[PDB]
């Protein structure tokens, strides 16, 4: 009974970062070999856990969060970072225990003339708490005058499209990101490695 990591890593469509997807991995056997062998990921960074020993560990639960961002922004998917993504879209906690995996997806998520499906939150009054997901689309009020749901001066739509084009520099090309969070609590461990 193997964990459905393929549904996450090999999904055909990915979510926007502001509406990042969370898959709950439980009651299964986790084989993390796909992370070591391939060298098909451009980012593989673990915190609070040893990367090479993942197959020896059991956990209460696993979370697989998935989204798409710019290459320039993959550095923000880590504990203690700041910027538009970490502040307004996807925030890891300082004591994060898990791994961040990312790979370039320019051939899949970029379209000629701009792909407008992937968005990021551009305006927000305060930062996100760790693992907070804000899907609001209310007009952002930048001044004292209320917006009443119409765009205009001091009244911005809070989301902006990445508009991924294949001509983009590597830093502005789309990257697919999966964050594995490892939860160890005083409960039965339902996700163990092989054997």
């Amino acid at each position, epitope marked *: 009974n193997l964990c459905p990591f393929g549904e996450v890593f090999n999904a055909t469509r990915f979510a926007s970062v502001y509406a990042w997807n969370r898959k709950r991995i439980s009651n299964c056997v986790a084989d993390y070999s796909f992370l070591y062998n391939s060298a098909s990921f451009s980012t593989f960074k673990c915190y609070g856990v040893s990367p090479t020993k993942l197959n020896d560990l059991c956990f209460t639960n696993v979370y697989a969060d998935s989204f798409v961002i710019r290459g320039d922004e993959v550095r923000q998917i880590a504990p203690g970072q700041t*910027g*538009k993504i970490a*502040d307004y879209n996807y925030k890891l906690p300082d004591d994060f225990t898990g791994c961040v995996i990312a790979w370039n997806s320019n051939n899949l998520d970029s379209k000629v003339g*701009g792909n407008y499906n992937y968005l990021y939150r551009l305006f927000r*009054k305060s930062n996100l708490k760790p693992f907070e997901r804000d899907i609001s689309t209310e007009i952002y*009020q*930048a001044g004292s005058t209320p917006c009443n749901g119409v765009e205009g001066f001091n009244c911005y739509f809070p989301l*902006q499209s990445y508009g991924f084009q294949p001509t983009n*520099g590597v830093g*502005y090309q789309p990257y697919r990101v999966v964050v594995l969070s490892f939860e160890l609590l005083h409960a039965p461990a339902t996700v163990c490695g092989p054997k």
Partner: antibody, heavy 117, light 109 residues
Framework: EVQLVESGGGLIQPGGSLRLSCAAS????????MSWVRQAPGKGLEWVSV???????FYADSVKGRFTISRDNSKNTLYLQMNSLRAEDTAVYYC???????????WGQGTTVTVSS | DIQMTQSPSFLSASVGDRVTITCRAS??????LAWYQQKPGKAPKLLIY???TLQSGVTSRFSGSGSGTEFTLTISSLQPEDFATYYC??????????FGQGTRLEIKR
């Protein structure tokens, strides 16, 4: 009225410190990206610093570690504290309400900083 | 870093002319580009954002086009208040933030 009013520029020796102020009207400072951009004599525009509505701050490499951007919400005012000033910091300094994809739409009138021994 | 190069450095034209100035990004940046105007001794004025969206209040004679690496600002009917310096900017409020070095539009004789 929508405006940014700057002050605090002046003449100072290298190694000195200077605080620039930027009072806003027509929008709320704490709810916007706010940037400092400078222009040396006869040169182009150089972005200096930015502060997010959520509080994150960022700096250009040329001033990182020496300048500090901040804000006072009670006065709706942006500040730039400049330490360890150098001759090449000499410039007209502008504040602006930044909008990322929306560009910088509201600019202050600029205040002049001269660093010389 | 992605460089932003404006061309040419100085451009001469007459009142009534149709004028184009170019900004080149060293790498593709989709439509994350702004155009500003600046007269001597005054602060910049936002003309275009999103490569083609005209800032409100700016005259329709200004038009921005291009996407990726080549961007153009076009002034369809030059009026005397248009003689100034014009800057481009990559649109991304995160370091590094880069402006073009500027194009000065001057009176032809």
């Amino acid at each position: 009225e929508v405006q940014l009013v700057e002050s605090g520029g002046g003449l100072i020796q290298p190694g000195g410190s200077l605080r620039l102020s930027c009072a806003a009207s027509g929008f709320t400072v704490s709810r916007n990206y706010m940037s400092w951009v400078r222009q040396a004599p006869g040169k182009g525009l150089e972005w200096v610093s930015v502060i997010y509505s959520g509080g994150s701050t960022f700096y250009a490499d040329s001033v990182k570690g020496r300048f500090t951007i901040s804000r006072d919400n009670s006065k709706n005012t942006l500040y730039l504290q400049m330490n360890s000033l150098r001759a090449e910091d000499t410039a007209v300094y502008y504040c602006a309400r930044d909008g990322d994809y929306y560009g910088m739409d509201v600019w202050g009138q600029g205040t002049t900083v001269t660093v010389s021994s | 870093d992605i460089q932003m190069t404006q061309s040419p450095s100085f451009l001469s034209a007459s009142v009534g002319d149709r004028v184009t100035i170019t900004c080149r990004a060293s790498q593709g940046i989709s439509s994350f580009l702004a155009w500003y105007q600046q007269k001597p001794g005054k602060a910049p004025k936002l003309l275009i954002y999103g490569a083609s969206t005209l800032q409100s209040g700016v005259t329709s004679r200004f038009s921005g086009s291009g996407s990726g690496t080549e961007f153009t600002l076009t002034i369809s009917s030059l009026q005397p208040e248009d003689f100034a310096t014009y800057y481009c900017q990559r649109l991304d409020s995160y370091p590094p933030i880069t402006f073009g070095q500027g194009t000065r539009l001057e009176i032809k004789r």
